[PDB]
Each structure stands twice: as C-alpha cells, then as structure tokens.
Write a protein that binds this ligand. Structure first.
Ligand SMILES: [Zn+2]
Ligand SMILES: [Zn+2]
Lengths: 6, 767, 726
C-alpha cells in the first residue's frame, strides 16, 4: 500500500 | 488514498471466512478477529484463546530494536468456543499429576520431542532432557510420533486441561466451591430510584440460574446477602429459619462478619427464607433517609466472610454514590484541573487513599473477586471505586444517571449475563516461553506480587490478559519461539484445574518476515493497554509522543529496509499495517489520552479500565465503531448490512444509521429521513414526532422494525456489556456526542492529518 | 427497760445506735472506745403508717433546711415553728391554717417521728429492666436461665420498659418490637465503647426506644426471642475456655441506658455463666491450663488481671451510680466468675450479687424470683435512685457512712473533717434500695472545749431519703431521732447503761471489714482486739492485776463473745474461701440489718431432743451430743446435724415403723423449721443434711503482737481478762 502525499 | 478499514475487514472475510483454519503450521498467520471462520485445533492454540502482534519473532534483540514492533500476545484463557467447534479435553496424569520438564517446568505438550525409544523426552522450551515417567512411557514409531499422539490430547492439541493434584492446592487440601455475596447499597438514592426493590425482586428470579457443572445436580456455589449505608446489615438465612435474622455492624473501620452458618447457604435449601428477606429489604429501608455510605468496609466485609468460610468467592456490589461517611477509604470530591501537561495529571486516575490497593491485595490473597454495579448520578471517583474490582479480576458496570423506565433492561441484562458467566476462581496464570525471550510485562484485570505470576482472584470468558515479551538471548530461525500459557484455578464445583495453551511462532533474521506476519488488531490492543497503564505514570503528552514516534519508527524501518525503491513523495505501509495508522489515530483521539473540554474524569477512568481487560475482538470494535446504514436495508432477507466508514461524510440527510462501539449503540436519523421508515420503527408518522429522551425498545413494525431489531441483536451477540441505546436526531440535537465516534473525522486530527503527520517524522528519520 | 427502748426505736425509726445516751464532750467520747454510730434502714417495713400525701415543709435557712418534725416547737396562735436544728423561726404554709394544739399536722406527732411524704415531681417514669445475658454455658443452664427470665418478665408492670442484650464472643443489642425480621446490633466483645459512641453507633438521639420498650407491648416478641435464644455458636477448642466478653457487654449496657434514660430508676441485670475471658474486664486466660486467681495467687502478686479487670468494673460502677442506675450480677458457674473484680458494681449501686453452681438449680431460681417480691399492694418492694441526707445537731458531726452507697460529696456544717468510710458528705446516693437496705453512719461529738454547755437537753439527727418507689410515685421518707446528752464526769453510768452491744458489735465489724479492703492488712485483728481490750478496761468491773475478778455488766457481757466470732470469721479470714466467695459474703454483710448481721457474725445453733422443745445452744462442740439433732443457721447456709445415736436410729429405719411415731417427728422437727427459712431468707441459703461421721460434718465442726490465735472462746476470754486488768 502506497500513499502519495500531495 | 489508503486501504480503509472496511475494505480490509471485508477482503479478509472474502478470502478467509467460511473456511476451516487448522492450527497445524507453526508461525501461521490467523484470520482477523473480524472474520468468521471455523477453527479446528490440531496442534497450536486457537486464535480465539490467543492472538499475537506478530506470528514471527525477530531473531535478535537488535533486530527487534530496529523495527520497534512490540512483540506481545493477547490471551483470553477461557474464551467462549463456538458450539460447532470442538471443546477442550481434560487430561488426568494421576497421583503424580501433570508431567512437566524438571528445569523450566513447562507442561507436557506437543512441544516435547520424545527421544531414545521414547524413554527420555527432550523439552522444547529449554532443551533439557527428561525421563518419561514409568506410567507414561510409550514406544516411538517412524520419526517419533509415539503411537500415542492422536490418542492423547496433551500430545496432539494446542489447548486442553490437566487435573491438578493436591500440591497444586492451597494448604495442600481440596479447595471448596466458591460463594456469591450480594451487597446492596440501600441508602436514599437507590431507595428512591427504585433500584433496591428492582435488585431484590429480580434477584429472586436470577438466583436460580446460578452456574453448576453438568456432572452435578445442584450448584455447589453458596450465597450470602448484605445491605448497607455507612453501616452494614448482615443477614442470617440458615436452612431452618422461618424468618431471616438481621445483624447490624456499625463498627466500620474495624469491620467484622458477625456470622458463620446462616451466611453463605445453598440457595436451594434456604430458598423460602431468602425470598422472604428479598421481599422485605425493599420495605425495610423504604423510609431510610440516609445519604452517605461507606465502601472499603463492604469489600472488606465480604472478603472477611469468605476468608472465614475458607472458600473463594465473588462480591456482587451494588453501589450508588461517592462514599463520604467517615471510615477507611472515605472518598472526597477531589476533581481538579490537573491535566493537559500537568505532569501531575496521573493522580486523577489513581485512588485517593492508600487503602484500596491494600484491600485489593488482601482480596487476591484470599481468592475474593469483586464485581461492581455502579449507578452514579454525580462524580463518584471511578479511579478509586474501580481499583479493587479491576485488580481483583472483577467487572465494572457503570450506569450514569440511572432511570428505571429506560435503563432497567440494560442493567438486568448485565446482571443476568454476569451471574451466568463461565468463571474460574483463585487463579494464577504463568506464561512460559522457549529459550531466548520471556514474558516481561502484563496488562489486564490482574494483580502481581512477583515478576512471573499473574494473579486473578476471578477470571471469566471475556477477560483477556495482554503479555509483552522481550529478548533474553538469541532465537533460532529453526526452532522459532514457543509460548505456553497456563492458568491454575478452582472451578465452581471446587476442583483444582489447569488450562494449557501452547502456541508455536516462527522466528527469523529477516525483517521482511517480521512485518509480513504482523496483526494490526493485536498491535493496537497492546499499544492501547500499554498507554492506558502509562497514564498512571507519565504525562499524557509523553505517552502520545511515544505512540506516534513508535508508529513512525516502525514504518521508517520498513521503508529503509524492506520496501522496494519508491518516490520520496510516497508513504509506504506493509499490508500487515495497512490500517494501523487509522486505528492508532483513534487511540490518540480517545478520551483517555485526550483532555478536559467535556468528558468527565469519571468517564475517562471508566474507559481506561474497560479497555485494560479487552481481547482483540473487543478492542478492534471499541476503537473503530461499526457504522451500519439502515434506510437502504434489504427487507426480511437480511444478514446485517455492509459496514460504512466512521466518517460524517458517509451520512445522508435521507438516511438512518446504526453506530456501535460495543458499549454505546447510536441510532442516527437524518432530517430528510423517510417518514415511511420513521413510521414502521417509532410508530410515529414524522421525524419531528420522535423524542430522543425516549430511547426505549420500539416493537410493532412488520418488515422493518423487525429487521432493525434483528441486526441490533446480532450486533450485541458476541459483546460482553449490553449496549446503551441512544437515538440521535440530526441537526443540533444530542448529536454532539455521536460525532465523537466518527473516529475518522477531526472531531484531535483527522485520519488524513495523522497520516500526513507520520510521513513527516518518517522523512525526518531521513531515509 | 433499755431492751424495750432499743427494740421500740428500731421498729419505729429503723435505727439502732451503739450508745443511746451520748457524752456531752468530745474527749470522753473519744475514750468511750465505740463511736456514736448507728445502723440505719431507710425503708424499714412500717405498714402501720399512711403515706400522707403532701410536700414535707422545710426550714427556711438555706444551710439547714430540715424537715418539720416532732422536735420543733410550735406557736399555733402565730402560725410559727422553730427548727430544732438551727432554731430559725419558720412560717407554716397556707393550707396548714387550721393547725392547733389539739389538731396538729401528722409530721409533728411523736408517733410519726419517721413518716413518708408523696412528692408531686411530675415526670412519672416507668421502671426500666435491662437483661444482659451471657450465652456461654451448657444448654441445661441457659435453658433454665431463659425460664427464670421469662418468669420475671411476667411480674414486671405493663408500663415498665424492658431491654435485651445477649453476649458471648461478641455483644448483641437486640432491637425489640422489630417484627417480621428480628434484628440486633453486634459489637466486638474485644473493645470498649463510651455511652456517646454507642449513642451514635446505635443511632439514637440525645437524652421508649427500639431497644427499651413496654412490657405490655413486647411480651409476645421478647418471650419468643428469650425462648429461641441458643448458646453462643462459636465452638470452643479442647483445653480452652469460651470467649465471654462480660466486661464489654456490661459497658455496652451501662452506656445504653446512660444515653437513653439517665437519672431514673432502672436495673441492669447481668447473668454470667463463667469468668470474663476477653477484656476489658477480662478476669482470666482462655486456656484451662491456668486456674482462676486465688486469694494466695492475688497475694503472691501472681494475678495479672485482678488490677486491670477491677479497674474496669469500678469505672463502670461509678458511671452507673452517677447516672442513677442499679447493676445486679447473677453469677452461676461451677468455678469463680470474677465477682471479686466486679463487686463494686453491685456494691456501689444498690445492686444484688447472687452466687450459684448453675442457673438450673432451685437455689438460683428461688433466689431470683424473690428478687421480684411484691408488697401488699402488688408493687415491687424496690426503691430507686434514692438520695439520703443527714442533718445533725450542732454538737454532732458526720464521720462517714459504710454500706451500699456513693458519696454526693455535699459539704456542710454537719460534715466532719475526720472522715470514716464514705465520708466528706452529708448526702449519699443509693441507686437501688429495699426495705432491708441498712447503712452504717458514724458520728463524731463536737463541743471539743471539754467543759462546755451540757445544756439544750438532747442532741438530734434527721435522715431524709428521697427515692422513686416501684409504683412510679416519687417519695421522701423522713426520720428524726433524739437521744439525751450526758455529763460523763457525773453520768458514766447513765451512759454505759445505754450501750447496745449487738449494734456496737456490728458497727465495729463494719469498720473492721471496710478496712480489710483498704490498704490495711492483718493489722485489722490487731486494731479490733486493741479496742476490745480498751472497752473492757473502761466498762468492766475489776481490781487491777486480778484477771479472776474481771466481770462485765449484762449490758456488755456478750460483746467479747461477738468479737471472738468475728475475728475468726470468713469476713476477716479470707484464705479458706475463694476471692469470689469472700466478696459475696462481705457484699451481704455490709448490707444487712442488725438482726441478720448478727447471725452472719455468730451462727445460731438450736438443739432438738426428745427431752424438751428446741432450745438455742452454745456454738461449742459441747453442744454436739449423741442423742441430739442440731440446726446450725449461719446466714448463708442452714445445716442439720444428726448426733451419733440418732444417726443409727435413722440408718436403722425406726422412722417408718408406726411404733416410733415421735422419732419420725423428731427427725422432721428441725427440717420443718429449715423449710421456713428456705423461703423467708432472701439470698436462699445453701442446705446441708449431715450426721455423725458424715462426709459433710466438716461444715459444722469448722464453724464450732495479736490478742490471740485460732483458739477457744475460753482461752480467748482468759488472755482477754488478764490484759484488761493490767
Ligand atoms: Zn524445559
Ligand atoms: Zn433550720
């Protein structure tokens, strides 16, 4: 699970 | 965009539900507690008795130190096993008693390698070789399966029970069956709210359902009765009195039991005399105008009575308010604003006098457990009234501002439930491990005088003790890490018994394996209890810091060692920890670790205790409430609607939802709430027609009111406390409370904010 | 005849002096050996008297305040009377107007020296009876006790408040009337409690209760409880004694009435079956191994409880006495119960002390019901919280008093500096009293300046006793007596003739016994003898250094013999009885009237024989003949002794034979007279039927520098005679 911090 | 809780729970239910879980492999990862599957022992203990934060321990202390993933186990020794699952077996090793390694004293379990033709068995916990006692010898066969194995539970199963021989008993003599002592606060408050009569009348019915083994015809458990208010009124109910006698002891301070014989009788034999008394107590104090009451003397008295009858017991105390009458344990109204950074905030959660801890120890020493049914209506100092019952292994039930026409059923449900609970007495749990690590910390409704024995005056099927392990030496990726929980106790029939739980975990020098085998629900249960115990020792902001930094540390470690190269703008989380942030944030948002603005200390203390006893099933739900949409409900053909995220975002002005955390059960109604539903449920034609203050069970209804009642039942099913229903009307109503359980919204910080926070410190750990 | 005088004045004024003619000077009285003293019975039976209903009428002088009496001069035609004690002129009350030389108010008639008034106090209180029961005894015993208790409860007036407290390892205070449940308050029999603490704990206000209720309202309930009462549950291990908190139970009972009905008639009646084993008030260990203290033990200072245990009861005694309540002790066990330590309670408050082997004996049962004797009008012969005041003429002073009482420390002109017994007062409080209660009041002559005014005629003394009659009626009993003054240097004769040897004897025995308790040891026999000698020397006929010549007037002749029997009596020679028995005897003797007192000091021995009617015979062995039957009557026991001849005739059977009608009678004669005494006497005496060579002849034989030793009356009289003449 990858989450791009915008 | 993260893998939400619901998705995670559902996906597991998909791939693992409705399937058999055989505990035959070693470090095998079990399904989530949220998944319903069938479990067949077959070697290692059922995940219902014991789950772990990781089923594969790091091999060395430094590894463990890199990752910072707490290695621990949530153990529910007497967890209720499904009807459709095989029950435990009772092994009797005769005169000698259970065979145990001479060195580490581990019991005879599937972890003992029988060698040399089956004459000597090497122990799997410390590698010591033992001599298979005469009577127990048996020939090995192909690779040593002993030709006994599948025939003897202790050799093939993970869980099972041993018969305890007299040297396992106090004073080396057969213990006596336990006794139940009912102590009713009859001061004004409980006379007025019609609680006294309630407890007496209803007690006539329930005293029948008192537990007793199938092997016997009548319960061996005797009963005793007491009333009080700054003074104690004992009662003699011998099976030969046409009328019950009453002995008042006003010498609080140096309390004593004025009886023996007539106090603790068989409810069956003394039936008519007890009922007689039960009809009377209500009238007897009807005009009592007493308001102040004592407390410590009551626990004091019951314990004493038990010590005298030389038997273990359980006190069912029914109290109403802050005990102010002068006597040891006199409680003041010390509610101060010492928090948020006071560093002295801890004192709010500790008992006032030094008496309660002592009383607790004396109780445990004599196998006396105290369960308290509290009906406060104003501050009561729960940090004090719930210590003895926590430490003693009892249960604490609080009913804020009790009102008969609303709370009667909730309390009576709790009481029935608590009486019929499967319970063991005067127990001591010991958690032995294999070479390399050991049990170093415990959390639960327990008391400990040394560093190895977890003493539980009383233990039941709901109670779960959480055990933290630490590295002692180095573990072998070959042998892994073994665990053997053993609880010695006395049964309601008066027998000394041992319950054993063996569990084989894997070991490894590879960090990938450590993470791949974690369980977020387990880890959260540990962090919660770990932090909740810390409240009594460190500034909350100190606790919160450790929690967050340990969370960021764990993920950082995984990032710089396991995760395949990915852009710095991304945040990586192992599948084992997908929902860990969400849940961790919930713990940090919880009132126990938060502060002053609203929420009574009494409410913080209460929750802090309730959680300390929880198992994984319980903690999962407590921190992340289950939110069900009811308006979109499939009529008669239901099976409990799909869960929806704990955010306000998933609420609709047109919908009706059900939110439960295991303690509170909210029925939320939107404004544009269909009148069709509001009719078939509350029997009133419109939204504005419902009154919140009338949160009582609504029957009637043919298709829906029934279908809603169905789900409310299935939700309460596996839950220990009976939930307090609370109806909420959308726009500006009591809703303020409701919003608190929407744990994903900001309310502390929102799920998204927290995720955003962790990434910062993970980046700080520049790597 | 002086003997008529003595009799008449005792029958009229329940008074008996050592001398009935007093020395007009302090000096000659000092060397008169026996002090001017009197044995006084405030409620002496007197049915010939009406209780005339009205206030007494007192002298107007504050420091005097005497009661109008026959000794006061009255000026009818001026409605005035002169107080005979301080001469103060006084006016009569309006209602007396008609008063005249020929029709005067009763109080002024000589026949009425000694009259009873009926105070119109107001608060007509009911009698209160508090049963403090011990439950550590065999079922036989406790059952009998339970029966005796029910009996008394049925004799109590319907208005009388009754309360029940049972005790053993712990103390229970029963809440009566409480129907449907029956409750009680339990306290550790291990620690004390103040009347306050108890008032608070039991939850009572300040100054009927749930604890003390009407007989006519509780009857049913109480009799049920009394009947369902069972012995203390807690089992007693081998070699051990029960845990009986006697000391604490009493303390709780005293306090119970202290905070509820203070200053009002009430009997706290504690029945015990053994010694208090769990102090305060603890009297002896719980391990049978150790015997209860003896008189020797207590003297070898080997009695570790005696001092503490007694210190406890004394305190209780003074509280109760000061609160105006009576304490009775009915101790019935095969061994000592601790009376010695507890004695002050019944001794200070006018309470009863009753000994026994078991409550399941006629001895006890009989005694206990005699306690509730009714008078001609069905009222208990009991009197409560009496207050006794004694005024004397200016030539006389009060030395002190000896008997059931407590000092009210009321100073005044009548009190003397030199005090005797309970002195330093002209007022004493007698919480419990009967028609038998007798006190010993010692006087002192004052006019010190030897040759002063013999004038004024006689000297006088008044006794005022206010009390609460069993009837609820408040009353004041008044007695005024006057004896003639005499110039000893011209009337030694008129003085010596007035001697009352019997009274004098007892009065002295009372002082001798009071000392025996006090810090004084066997120096008693010493002082007692010294006095006997001095008396012989001053009132005996004789030529110096010629014993054979010594002879006493018939007025004194018996005094010597009295002393002889006193000094060898159990009252001063404790070492042959248990500390408990000793206390029991002294208790009764310091109470008794002159008559019973005498029998106690010198047992009467009557002989029966075919040759003539029963005739008192010398308390000598010589009186023991073969053809004679003896009836020895000490006060505490009635013994019948069959002489050798008669013993054989009786063991032979001649009695049944119709030929020997008379013999059968002779055997019965003494037995019949023993039956009368065995009902009439209050503490019912122990009975004994023995004969020549009987296992119990001992009881008779035994009863049959220092002035002498354990010798015979003759030798004693000899050594006496010679010392009197030199
Ligand atoms: Zn081992
Ligand atoms: Zn006068």
């Amino acid at each position: 699970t990858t989450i791009p911090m915008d | 965009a993260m893998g939400s809780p619901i998705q995670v729970i559902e996906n597991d239910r998909a791939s693992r539900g409705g399937q058999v879980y055989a505990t035959n492999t070693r470090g095998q990862i079990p399904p989530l507690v949220t998944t319903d599957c069938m479990i067949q022992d077959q070697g290692n203990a059922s995940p219902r008795f014991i789950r772990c934060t990781t089923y594969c321990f790091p091999c060395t202390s430094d590894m463990a130190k890199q990752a910072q993933i707490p290695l621990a186990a949530v153990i529910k020794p007497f967890a209720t096993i499904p009807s459709n699952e095989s029950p435990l077996y009772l092994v009797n090793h005769g005169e000698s008693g259970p065979v145990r390694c001479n060195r580490c004293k581990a019991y005879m379990c599937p972890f003992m390698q029988f060698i040399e033709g089956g004459r000597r068995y090497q122990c799997g916990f410390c590698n010591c070789v033992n001599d298979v006692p005469p009577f127990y010898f048996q020939h090995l066969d192909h690779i040593g399966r002993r030709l006994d194995h599948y025939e003897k539970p202790e050799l093939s199963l993970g869980s099972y029970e041993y018969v305890a021989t007299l040297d396992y008993c106090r004073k080396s003599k057969p213990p006596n069956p336990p006794a139940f002592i009912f102590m009713i606060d009859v001061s004004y408050s409980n006379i007025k709210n019609g609680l006294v009569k309630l407890i007496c009348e209803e007690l006539k019915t329930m005293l029948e359902k008192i537990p007793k083994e199938e092997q016997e015809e009548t319960s061996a458990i005797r009963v005793g009765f007491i009333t009080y208010n700054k003074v104690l009124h004992f009662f003699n109910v011998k099976s030969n009195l046409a009328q019950p006698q009453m002995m008042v002891v006003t010498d609080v301070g140096e309390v004593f039991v004025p009886l023996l014989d007539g106090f603790l009788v068989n409810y069956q034999e003394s039936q008519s005399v007890i009922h007689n008394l039960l009809d009377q107590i209500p009238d007897m104090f009807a005009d009592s105008n007493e308001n102040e009451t004592v407390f410590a003397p009551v626990i004091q008295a019951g314990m004493e009575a038990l010590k005298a009858a030389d038997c273990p017991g359980k006190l069912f105390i029914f109290h109403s308010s802050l005990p102010t009458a002068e006597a040891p344990g006199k409680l003041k109204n010390r509610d101060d604003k010492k928090l948020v950074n006071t560093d002295k905030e801890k004192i709010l959660f500790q008992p006032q006098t030094n008496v309660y801890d002592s009383l607790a120890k004396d109780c445990v020493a004599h196998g006396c457990s105290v369960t308290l049914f509290l009906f406060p209506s104003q501050y009561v100092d729960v940090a004090s009234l719930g210590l003895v019952p926590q430490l003693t292994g009892g249960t604490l039930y609080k009913y804020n501002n009790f009102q008969m026409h609303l709370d009667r059923q909730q309390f009576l449900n709790d009481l029935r439930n608590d009486i019929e609970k499967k319970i063991g007495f005067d127990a001591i749990m010991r958690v032995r491990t294999s070479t390399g690590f050991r049990a170093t910390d415990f959390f639960g409704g327990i008391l400990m005088n040394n560093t190895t024995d977890v003493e539980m005056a009383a233990i039941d099927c709901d109670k779960a003790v959480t055990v933290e392990f630490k590295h002692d030496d180095k573990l072998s990726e070959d042998s892994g890490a073994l665990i053997q929980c053993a609880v010695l106790y006395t049964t309601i029939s008066g027998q000394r018994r041992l319950r054993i739980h063996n569990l084989g975990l894997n070991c490894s020098s590879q960090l990938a394996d450590l993470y791949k085998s974690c369980e977020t629900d387990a880890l959260i249960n540990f962090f919660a209890k770990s932090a909740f115990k810390a409240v009594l020792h460190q500034p909350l902001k100190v606790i919160r810091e450790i929690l967050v930094n340990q969370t960021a540390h764990m993920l950082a470690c995984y990032r710089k060692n396991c995760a395949s190269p990915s852009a710095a703008s991304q945040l990586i989380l192992p599948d084992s920890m997908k929902v860990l942030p969400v849940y961790m944030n919930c713990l940090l948002k919880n009132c126990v670790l938060l502060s002053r603005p609203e929420i009574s200390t009494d409410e913080r203390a209460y929750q802090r205790q309730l959680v300390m006893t929880m198992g994984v099933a319980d903690s999962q739900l407590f921190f992340y409430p289950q939110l069900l949409p009811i308006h979109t409900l499939d009529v008669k053909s239901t099976m409990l609607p799909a869960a929806v995220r704990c955010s306000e975002s998933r609420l609709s002005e047109e919908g009706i939802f059900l939110l439960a955390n295991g303690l509170h059960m909210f029925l939320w109604l939107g404004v544009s709430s269909p009148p069709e539903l509001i009719q078939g449920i509350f029997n009133v034609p419109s939204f504005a027609h419902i009154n919140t203050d009338m949160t009582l069970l609504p029957e009637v209804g043919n298709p829906y009111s029934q279908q809603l009642r169905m789900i409310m039942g299935i939700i309460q099913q596996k839950r220990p406390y009976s939930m307090k229903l609370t109806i909420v009307k959308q726009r500006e109503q009591p809703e303020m409370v409701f919003r608190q359980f929407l744990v994903e919204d900001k309310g502390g910080s929102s799920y998204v904010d927290f995720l955003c926070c962790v990434h910062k410190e993970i980046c700080q750990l520049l790597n | 005849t002086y003997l008529e005088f003595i009799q008449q004045n005792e029958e009229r004024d329940g008074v008996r002096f050592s001398w009935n003619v007093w020395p007009s000077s302090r000096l000659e009285a000092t060397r008169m050996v026996v002090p001017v003293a009197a044995l006084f019975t405030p409620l002496k039976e007197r049915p010939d008297l009406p209780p005339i209903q009205y206030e007494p009428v007192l002298c107007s002088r504050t420091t005097c305040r005497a009661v109008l009496n026959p000794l006061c001069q009255v000026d009818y035609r001026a409605k005035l009377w002169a107080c005979n004690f301080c001469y103060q002129r006084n006016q009569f009350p309006p209602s007396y107007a008609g008063i005249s030389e020929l029709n005067q108010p009763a109080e002024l008639l000589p026949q009425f020296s000694s009259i009873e008034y009926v105070v119109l106090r107001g608060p007509q209180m009911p009698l209160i009876f508090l049963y403090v029961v011990d439950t550590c005894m065999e079922d036989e015993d406790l059952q009998a006790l339970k029966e005796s208790m029910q009996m008394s409860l049925s004799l109590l007036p319907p208005t009388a408040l009754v309360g029940l407290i049972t005790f053993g390892r712990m103390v229970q205070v029963h809440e009566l009337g409480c129907e449907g449940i029956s409750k009680s308050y339990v306290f550790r029999g291990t620690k004390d409690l103040s009347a306050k603490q108890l008032q608070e704990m039991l939850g009572l206000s300040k100054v009927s209760n749930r604890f003390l209720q009407p007989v006519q309202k509780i009857d049913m309930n109480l009799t049920d409880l009394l009947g369902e009462l069972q012995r203390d549950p807690w089992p007693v291990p081998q070699g051990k004694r029960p845990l009986r908190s006697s000391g604490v139970a009493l303390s709780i009972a005293v306090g119970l009435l202290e905070c509820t009905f203070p200053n009002t008639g009430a009997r706290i009646m504690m029945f015990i079956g053994g010694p208090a084993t769990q102090g305060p008030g603890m009297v002896v260990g719980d391990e049978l191994k150790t015997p209860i203290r003896s008189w020797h033990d207590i003297d070898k200072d080997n009695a570790k409880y005696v001092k503490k245990g007694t210190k406890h009861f004394e305190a209780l005694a003074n509280r109760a006495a000061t609160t105006g309540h009576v304490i009775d002790i009915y101790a019935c066990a095969l061994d000592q119960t601790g009376l010695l330590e507890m004695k002050c309670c019944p001794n200070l408050t006018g309470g009863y002390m009753v000994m026994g082997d078991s409550f399941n004996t006629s001895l006890f049962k009989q005694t206990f019901q005699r306690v509730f004797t009714k008078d001609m009008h069905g009222q208990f012969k009991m009197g409560f919280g009496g207050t006794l005041e004694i005024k004397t003429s200016r030539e006389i002073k009060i030395s002190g008093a000896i008997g059931p009482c407590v000092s009210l420390n009321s100073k005044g002109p009548c009190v003397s500096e030199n005090e005797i017994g309970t002195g330093g007062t002209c007022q004493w409080k007698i919480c419990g009293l009967s028609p038998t209660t007798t006190l010993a009041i010692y006087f002192e002559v004052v006019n010190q300046h030897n040759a002063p005014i013999p004038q004024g005629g006689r000297g006088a003394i008044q006794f005022v006793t206010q009390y609460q009659h069993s009837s609820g009626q408040r009353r004041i009993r008044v007695t005024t007596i006057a004896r003639n003054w005499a110039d000893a240097q011209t009337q030694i004769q008129n003085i010596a003739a007035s001697f009352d040897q019997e009274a004098a004897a007892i009065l002295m025995a009372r002082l001798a016994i009071y000392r025996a308790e006090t810090e004084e040891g066997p120096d008693v026999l010493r002082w007692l003898d010294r006095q006997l000698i001095r008396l012989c020397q001053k009132f005996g006929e004789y030529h110096k250094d010629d014993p054979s010549s010594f002879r006493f007037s018939e007025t004194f002749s018996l005094y010597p013999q009295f002393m002889f029997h006193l000094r060898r009596s159990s009252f001063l020679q404790v070492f042959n009885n248990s500390p408990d028995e000793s206390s029991y005897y002294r208790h009764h003797f310091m109470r008794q009237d002159l008559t019973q007192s005498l029998i106690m000091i010198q047992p009467i021995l009557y002989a029966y024989s075919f040759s003539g009617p029963p005739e008192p015979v010398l308390l000598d062995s010589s009186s023991i003949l073969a053809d004679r039957i003896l009836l020895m009557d000490t006060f505490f026991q009635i013994l019948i002794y069959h002489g050798e001849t008669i013993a054989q005739w009786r063991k032979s059977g001649y009695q049944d034979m119709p030929e020997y009608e008379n013999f059968r009678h002779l055997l019965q004669a003494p037995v019949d007279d023993a039956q009368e005494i065995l009902h009439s006497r209050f503490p019912m005496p122990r009975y004994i039927d023995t004969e020549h060579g009987g296992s119990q002849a001992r009881f008779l034989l035994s009863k049959v520098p220092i002035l002498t030793d354990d010798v015979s009356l003759q030798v004693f009289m000899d050594h006496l005679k010679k010392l009197a003449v030199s």
